[PDB]
């Protein structure tokens, strides 16, 4: 018996007392962060114990048991290498290799304010393991990356049926044969989707509803808002105004939709800010069936998550979608600011961010990273989990 | 140390001798078939032991181990319930229920010859577990179902880069903007793919080679040829001759291709016969990373299997591909014979066969079953493996 | 010698005095109207002569010569049967038949205001000969019928080269590959054309200018404006706003176009009013090479008249344009109020008006008429003028 | 009276006799050729006189009446300037100038055998006036130019309603929405049209039925057949077999149609040979309401000649049809050998020939000519016959 104690002899080398930093280094290598919310109680009790004790703060069996008894379940999984990527220490070295090789990719043209030398990669696994390399804490806008997220919110609140009364499920002209936009990843679809979220309420409260929803998936990491970007998208969004009026003409919005107001809302949502780190948790929530991996909170119905990953796969890269789903085989969404919201189902989320776009408007370093990643690891949607050639499988040991 | 001995008392309740029927029963319930090629040695050693005496043979530790020792790796994996679906008996009960529901769907138009009340479904898991129900042993033609298999052969022999010099990878007019056919799931793509398989050799031996390949994928289960279908497809292949001549004009074939002969080959390949059972093993090879699960032989390269599963996802249902990959989320291919080649990556392959077709040319019961299957079990491409709502997961116990 | 005298005995059968009504009757029978502008001096001279006595006021050679000498060329051309249709009294009998056969056509749905039983036809030959039958003096709106006229204006003021930097000349999605609207008969094209008329000056004066121009083409017959139509067209021009924003994003307008203003103008232009009679003179000006046939003043350059007639042929019926150019072979534009602007080059212009439209939005009676017209008379663009089968040729005697 | 005598003093300057050569030069100047079939009798009687009076001829009134009394109608019309283009001698000056200006355009690629500096234009008016300059007696194949003619033949024998069951009449995909080819000027339409001409008979007599027909419209001038070309069009007619099988699939041909034998007929018709001269009469018959101008024989119904001219206008220049119909406005058809069958309705027919094609496959020198021609003369479809700015009008004198 004695769970908290089983752990205790695992981290102490058949010794009497664990040094506090040694437990912390043991914890940090599992990829978890000490700032992890599922660890607060443990980590508070740890700071308080350093506080009520002497300088050479060392934890005996009984004191270790006191701090860890509150989060022993997660702490046990973390230390028994039961997390989805057990040798997380090695995996992140490869993510570094992938980052550096993707960094030497110099091409591309920034949309038109940011520097073409920003290049950030954040990883968040379905179990909470974090890794980052490059400029991962800079705020940028989701832009078209918000489209999966707000479609998820719509489906989570209204169900696959209702949302898909107003938008289709097939890649793409503005409307398909049923006089609905083809799919919610294209602008015409996103605008109708935006017209479903929190109807009746006004755009100020709508925007807060989606803001708090994104906060839940980001594990309460940074979800911001660039009003500066908002002004530009609404001043030079002539293309979207075209879509808005056309949608209005073909009666695509729900009953009583203030079309010009839905467009302003829509311009706001494209202007929501994230960092690589915060958004990689958002991705990971989609990877994790709707449960935010660093909180354990259910944020999205599995219905909603499955749908969003589905359409991200078939419609998230626009015309490149067939090519991208062929070589990468991961659901992903792209953004003019240079972000790739990338989901490896059941394993992890990622955000890549390099502001230089390629000819198709996808961050060059992102796309190069995404290819490189699936080259290396058997994460392609149709790699075998048993016979995966010479690819490495992060999910296994030895 | 006693590998085969550990198994002995697992099957005999701390008793002296195991009746031979009890072991067989215990095997059949593991999902495996006594006729499994990977058990051939052991089943011969039992055919031998049943000769020394014509009375209910009881096997002691020494003589049991004498038969089981040649197949002990695979035999304990089954009895320790290590297979991809551990409780395989329960899982076939739901397959029966799913088969019965779809059987009540009497809609559909048979192409025009078969009988509209035939209906078989067959399962072959990645580990060789097999269940069938319905008319699983009647030969029917692959028709378009053959397109992923012969694509796979092409890429297996010539690789992604070469095969995709002649055909594209995105869903659909006959050519795309690069002057290649859109993808190998459509006739124009199928025809070009046919023209890559064993160039230089002639059409009689080409067809033998594909046939040897198709035998490998079915673990040497039933593959046949319906000449009657073959004459139909050539006598009425007016659209196909058009596609061929157009392909000839736009120089889509490789150097020195006899297009009018390539069409015959193509009509041959569509006329290949399978049954549910044999085809379910084929699908299962694509389920299993390219290893035929009932023989263990590597039949198709991971590269070839991945690509084939990719293009089935995006192009295997044609227009219905978005609709279908949204709700069902499994790579499939249909054929006018009534066949749905179904693949559940990493779990199993299937063939569904009911000749009544809907207005899209897909098996009515086949489609209904596919939908029920993902309704019931978390096999959808983008279900979570951890949070999957009230869906059942056959990969787990209890 | 003695022209005015030569005419004199032509009207008096070897007699001394001509009863003034008898000249009037002989005038009206050549087709001209006593209100004809080219006859105003003579009619002033006759009002004076009818002022000196109140008793039939017969005219001798001296007083007749005193009235008609100011308009003797036109008058002898009428009485010496030099006009484009000489036996014009006959020709209007057939226009009455055509009017009647077509009044029996009951189909159609009025767009949504008017009454479905209004039906007028107006003819004005290139020589000023006038005929009407039915409700030819009710004001209605041109709607899209205005699109040839304002295209004619643009080309007249800017020439073909300039106008066709901004719009194309082929039938049809909004833009062509040159990112110009397809042709100025489609709404996207009309809007671009609208933005070229009198750039710089504001929308109140731009409207005046087009109005002055429309006056020149109707020979100062009725042109009005329906603010009722105007507010409706702008309240519900959602599709036109969609088009306006799209054209703005694709940079289709000239530099410095207030696009939401150009739409307003456009709605104004569509709300302009004509009667059958006034619009038939407008048609007749395009019929007569750019000279208003009832005033003789050059309104439009031969360049502009040619381009307009050309684009009405190919683009004026939208979808019906091939069917119509095949069977009817007369350049025409249609309007949702029920207007068919008809042009028989070198012979006459015409207006038909019945508010009931068919499914393609063309006046039912209008279209039946146009087909009937070309059944009867060799006006089809590719009828022969020498061997026209059994068709009637109004251009000839006997 | 005596029309012959009135003609007689018109050539003789109030003098006793007419030198036979003076009458001949006066006749040739009107544009007629002495070989004109309508002049056969006159010219026979004339040659017989030179034999009967081997002096200096010189015909007195009685003798001139004896030669001309048989063709007096045509002969006076020629000499009283009654022909459609009365000052024909000056008109040919312009054709020569137009020819020389078009001769300096050396651009273009000959399709692939002929020489790039071959350039002939040949005119035949509706009245029989001839003029040619350059290589007008070299044989070349109609190629696509036969399409208007064989369409005309179809509608001659079977009428508008019937032919257009099987083919549409709107410009361009291989079929349209009605599953008929779009119009008889594209291959898809021409191949169906071919399958309507003289059904039931076999290809050997069908080709003589069409050949005797072309001979009539060419006034029995050269109509030949290149069996040389005919091999080329069938060896490399892959696209045509594409179209053929597709049309067979969609049952576009009439009941009991040998599609492979229609394709063979079709290749023959494309290989028929003409010269500029012989084909210029062919065009002219279309300009003349179906009457071959140099014979007076009615070769085609007016219904048929209308239809053909209509579709030449809208579909005869393929994608260039709208541009061409805008700037040139004449019905014309182009051919890969370098021919432009060109009709100026009611005025003349004409054939142009330069083998260098432009990017669109149209005789570079022909197209330049066609533009130069309508620049010069008010022959554009929507030119005014009364107000035509700086253009010349050959239909007038002075």
Curated annotation (Swiss-Prot), chains A, B, C, D:
Its EC number is 3.5.1.2. One of its GO terms (molecular function) is glutaminase activity. Substrate binds at residues 144, 187, 233, 240, 266, 318, 336. GO terms for biological process: chemical synaptic transmission; glutamate biosynthetic process; glutamine catabolic process; intracellular glutamate homeostasis; protein homotetramerization; regulation of respiratory gaseous exchange by nervous system process; suckling behavior. Changing residue 144 to A: Loss of enzyme activity. The modification N6-succinyllysine is found at residue 28. Keywords: Acetylation, ANK repeat, Cataract, Cytoplasm, Disease variant, Epilepsy, Hydrolase, Mitochondrion, Phosphoprotein, Repeat, Transit peptide. Changing residue 246 to A: Decreased enzyme activity. Homotetramer, dimer of dimers. The tetramers can assemble into rod-like oligomers (in vitro), but the physiological significance of this is not clear. Interacts with RAF1 and MAP2K2. Interacts with ATCAY; the interaction is direct and may control GLS localization, negatively regulating its activity. Catalyzes the first reaction in the primary pathway for the renal catabolism of glutamine. Plays a role in maintaining acid-base homeostasis. Regulates the levels of the neurotransmitter glutamate, the main excitatory neurotransmitter in the brain. It is linked to Developmental and epileptic encephalopathy 71: A form of epileptic encephalopathy, a heterogeneous group of severe early-onset epilepsies characterized by refractory seizures, neurodevelopmental impairment, and poor prognosis. Development is normal prior to seizure onset, after which cognitive and motor delays become apparent. DEE71 is an autosomal recessive form with onset at birth. Death occurs in first weeks of life. This is Glutaminase kidney isoform, mitochondrial. It comes from Homo sapiens (Human). The gene is GLS. The chain holds residues 137 to 546 of 669 of the full protein.
């Amino acid at each position: 018996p004695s769970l908290e104690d089983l752990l205790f002899y695992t981290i102490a080398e058949g010794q009497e007392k664990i040094p506090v930093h040694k437990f912390i280094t043991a914890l940090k290598s599992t990829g978890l962060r000490t700032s992890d919310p599922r660890l607060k109680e443990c980590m508070d009790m740890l700071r308080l114990t350093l506080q009520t004790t002497s300088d050479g703060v060392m934890l005996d069996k009984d004191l270790f048991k006191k701090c860890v008894q509150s989060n022993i379940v997660l702490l046990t999984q973390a230390f028994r290498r039961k997390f989805v990527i057990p040798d997380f220490m090695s995996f992140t070295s490869h993510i570094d290799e992938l980052y550096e090789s993707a960094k030497k990719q110099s091409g591309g043209k920034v949309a038109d304010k940011f520097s073409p030398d920003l290049w950030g990669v954040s990883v968040c696994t379905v179990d909470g393991q974090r890794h980052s390399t490059g400029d991962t804490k800079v705020p940028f806008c989701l832009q078209s990356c918000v489209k999966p997220l707000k479609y998820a919110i719509a489906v989570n609140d209204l169900g696959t049926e209702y949302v898909h009364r107003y938008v289709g499920k097939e890649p793409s002209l503005f409307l398909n044969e049923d006089d609905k936009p083809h799919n919610p990843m294209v602008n015409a679809g996103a605008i109708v989707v935006t017209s479903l979220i929190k109807q009746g309420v006004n755009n100020a409260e709508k925007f807060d509803y989606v803001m708090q929803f994104l906060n839940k998936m980001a594990g309460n990491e940074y979800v911001g808002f660039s009003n500066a970007t908002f002004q530009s998208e609404r001043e030079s969004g002539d293309r979207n105004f075209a879509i808005g009026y056309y949608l209005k003409e073909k009666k695509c919005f729900p009953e009583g939709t203030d079309m010009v107001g839905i467009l302003d809302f829509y311009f706001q949502l494209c202007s929501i800010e994230v960092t690589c780190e915060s958004a990689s948790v958002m991705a990971a929530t989609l990877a994790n069936g709707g449960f935010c991996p660093i909180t354990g909170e259910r944020v999205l119905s599995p219905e909603a998550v499955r749908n969003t990953l589905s359409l991200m796969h078939s419609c998230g890269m626009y015309d490149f979608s067939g090519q991208f789903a062929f070589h990468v085989g991961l659901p992903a969404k792209c953004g003019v600011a240079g972000g790739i919201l990338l989901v490896v189902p059941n394993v992890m989320g990622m955000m890549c961010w390099s502001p230089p776009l390629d000819k198709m408007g996808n961050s060059v370093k992102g796309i190069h990273f995404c290819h490189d990643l699936v080259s290396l690891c058997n994460f392609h949607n149709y790699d075998n989990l048993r016979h995966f050639a010479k690819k490495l499988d992060p999910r296994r040991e030895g």
